[PDB]
Write an enzyme that holds these catalytic residues in place. Sequence first.
Site, PDB file in Angstrom:
ATOM      1  N   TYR A 101       0.848  -1.180   0.000  1.00  0.00           N
ATOM      2  CA  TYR A 101       0.000   0.000   0.000  1.00  0.00           C
ATOM      3  C   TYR A 101       0.895   1.246   0.000  1.00  0.00           C
ATOM      4  CZ  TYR A 101      -3.766  -3.239   1.333  1.00  0.00           C
ATOM      5  OH  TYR A 101      -4.680  -4.275   1.351  1.00  0.00           O
ATOM      6  N   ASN A 124     -12.328   0.976  -6.984  1.00  0.00           N
ATOM      7  CA  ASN A 124     -11.971   0.349  -8.256  1.00  0.00           C
ATOM      8  C   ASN A 124     -13.158  -0.371  -8.888  1.00  0.00           C
ATOM      9  OD1 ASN A 124     -10.650  -0.722 -10.447  1.00  0.00           O
ATOM     10  ND2 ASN A 124      -9.691  -2.391  -9.295  1.00  0.00           N
ATOM     11  N   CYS A 132      -5.990  -4.702  -8.277  1.00  0.00           N
ATOM     12  CA  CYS A 132      -6.018  -4.257  -6.888  1.00  0.00           C
ATOM     13  C   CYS A 132      -5.663  -5.410  -5.952  1.00  0.00           C
ATOM     14  CB  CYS A 132      -7.398  -3.677  -6.528  1.00  0.00           C
ATOM     15  SG  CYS A 132      -8.814  -4.731  -6.918  1.00  0.00           S
ATOM     16  N   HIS A 133      -5.760  -6.639  -6.452  1.00  0.00           N
ATOM     17  CA  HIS A 133      -5.432  -7.805  -5.639  1.00  0.00           C
ATOM     18  C   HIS A 133      -3.917  -7.951  -5.466  1.00  0.00           C
ATOM     19  CE1 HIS A 133      -5.352  -9.054  -9.785  1.00  0.00           C
ATOM     20  NE2 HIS A 133      -4.443  -9.983  -9.454  1.00  0.00           N
ATOM     21  N   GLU A 159      -1.465 -16.426  -9.526  1.00  0.00           N
ATOM     22  CA  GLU A 159      -0.301 -15.740 -10.079  1.00  0.00           C
ATOM     23  C   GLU A 159       1.057 -16.239  -9.571  1.00  0.00           C
ATOM     24  OE1 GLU A 159      -0.791 -11.475 -10.231  1.00  0.00           O
ATOM     25  OE2 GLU A 159      -2.876 -11.638 -10.915  1.00  0.00           O
TER      26      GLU A 159
END
Length: 168
Positions: A101, A124, A132-133, A159
């Site tokens: 962040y 978002n 945003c993840h 990912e």
Amino acid sequence: CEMKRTTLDSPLGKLELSGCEQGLHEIKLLGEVPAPAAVLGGPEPLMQCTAWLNAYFHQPEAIEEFPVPALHHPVFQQESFTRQVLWKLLKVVKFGEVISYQQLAALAGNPKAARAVGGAMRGNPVPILIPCHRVVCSSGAVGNYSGGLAVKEWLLAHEGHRLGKPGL
Ligand SMILES: [Zn+2]
């Protein structure tokens, strides 16, 4: 701004895509086998979003090949800290990468605005597409997610991160 909608099934459940000729407006999570959008065809941003999401979930190695559609949600129409955050995120943080962040706040011009960044992650309208993840805690913790913790973990596990894909 004629609003059109289509829905796409996905590992995260049904996704409602909405947009117009000018761009994609929103990707809404309504809650193993690739599925098609319920309604095919334009506007172009919608078709582009469907192909991008299909690739993200089912052909991730080729995700960079798919064009990100033009965005037309009002948050992108005006200049604000939120828009800068969202655009910075979309541009910098790639598939498999994470950012804290604080780093995103620094990237957006104010190293002390981590809390504002967190709030922006909820403003978002196009989750997954604007990753945003991938905004996580400097402590290594996954952190909060508008769509629920399990979803954030599923995406991060997808990912490459050493987390197990939870039951969704
Ligand atoms: Zn529009």
